[PDB]
Design an enzyme around this catalytic site. Structure first.
Site, mmCIF file in Angstrom:
data_model
loop_
_atom_site.group_PDB
_atom_site.id
_atom_site.type_symbol
_atom_site.label_atom_id
_atom_site.label_comp_id
_atom_site.label_asym_id
_atom_site.label_seq_id
_atom_site.Cartn_x
_atom_site.Cartn_y
_atom_site.Cartn_z
ATOM 1 N N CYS A 128 35.163 -29.534 85.582
ATOM 2 C CA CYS A 128 34.312 -30.666 85.958
ATOM 3 C C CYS A 128 33.608 -31.101 84.675
ATOM 4 C CB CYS A 128 33.274 -30.251 87.014
ATOM 5 S SG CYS A 128 32.038 -31.537 87.412
ATOM 6 N N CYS A 131 29.691 -31.694 84.824
ATOM 7 C CA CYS A 131 28.789 -30.573 84.642
ATOM 8 C C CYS A 131 28.933 -30.000 83.240
ATOM 9 C CB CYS A 131 29.054 -29.501 85.687
ATOM 10 S SG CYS A 131 28.702 -30.034 87.364
#
EC number: 1.11.1.28
Lengths: 172, 173, 175
Positions: A128, A131
């Site tokens: 991701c 993040c």
């Protein structure tokens, strides 16, 4: 753990070597290192690697760090799906309140930069960028060197291969 | 989800708190909600989370939606890989026939909406932008609240956190 | 194949039908195809599927092929996390000498194009465009028509569906 390196197949020769070299990193301090290895191990879902790394980490990590690391993997386990998903939606849902409890990120009971370094690590494994980037930004903002950030990345990847080389043993 | 909640470690408090609330949501009807939890639980591939949730999603779903929920996770297990990889290939493989059967997408014993919703939830867990994006679009055009779609996304991520946390204790206890 | 296939859920018939067709295809070599099925099966991390696919792979592949194919999943498990990570950091770290051992990639115990196809397949499963795109570029260079590359992608997706479908029945099977 030597038992972890020894369980590795011969065709995973590079993994073993990368594992041995990363365990000896001079780029990160003990807590940063082992917490990354432990948090990464948790995110692989491979019980084997978690056990050994968790066992090896016991004399580099206090009970606090150990827990916060597993905690990192658990919260990122939720965050890497939500933010990534919201990130694919062009922002259309950015105006909504997530309503997700995530206090451990506020107070991980351990020095912040470490919990971030570990969330960075896990975020890399789950994949991701939302993040990964936020943490990579906070890390630089708080004064963590690029070299240290990269190491955690390397550590996340070596451990992913380790876990993968292990799972590949299911062919006697 | 009583079993799971109690199983969670205190360093996973936020996961615990999040689970118990998502199960009490009221923005998604009993079908939309439990289908999501189920398809989500399956997609996490954690035996424990799927069992508990499955054993409870039963008294919330007709046998049609269950099968459908479960088949959504399964079919997207394929679709999410094919579509993503193809998506990454500079469009050089857009004219080819996939030759992949997926009659289930021609939808199961339920209306194409919840299933579209469950495929959405699974795609988020698997990390497939192409599919996530398409279903969100299709869900709006059909008349589904963005807040519901949003809720399905949260339920998916929450369940993922439950899976991760639970997999850890079971490997360290 | 038949066992695995037979073990699948009623809500996964497309998967069953796809496994079966992919296994009996003729677009890829016997070495290309089974090397992919096994590299893929390994990437899903499902013990059952690796065991079933790893079993049948013995009479379609040579030990070297299988070792190298499982080795492809192994090194890709590392690389796919690394390069994708670098990717998200917009190259800001492309100048730090990764310092990661690989070699296998340069010296697999088999023809490179096959190791690439399998690595390509594993990358598809883990979701790393950098590696996928990179193995894709090399494949096309030394031959392998997009027809072949496309098949491996298909196989990877199908084996991906298999694992998922199998995993839910094992977990939802009575007691």
């Amino acid at each position: 753990i030597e038992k972890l390196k020894a369980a590795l197949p011969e065709y995973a020769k590079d993994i073993k070597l990368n594992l041995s070299s990363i365990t000896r990193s001079s780029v990160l301090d003990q807590e940063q290192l082992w917490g990354t290895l432990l948090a990464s191990a948790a995110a692989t879902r491979n019980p084997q690697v978690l056990a050994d790394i968790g066992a090896e980490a016991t004399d580099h990590l206090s009970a606090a760090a150990r827990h916060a690391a597993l905690g990192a993997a658990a919260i990122m386990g939720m965050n890497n799906v939500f933010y990534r998903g919201r990130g694919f939606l062009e922002g259309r849902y950015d105006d909504l309140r997530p309503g997700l409890r995530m206090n451990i990120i506020a107070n991980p009971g351990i020095p912040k930069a470490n919990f971030e370094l570990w969330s960075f690590a896990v975020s890399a494994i789950n994949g991701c960028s939302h993040c990964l980037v936020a943490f990579e930004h906070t890390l630089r903002t708080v004064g963590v060197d690029r070299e240290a950030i990269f190491e955690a990345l390397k550590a996340a990847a070596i451990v992913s291969g380790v876990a993968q080389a292990l799972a590949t043993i299911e062919a006697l």
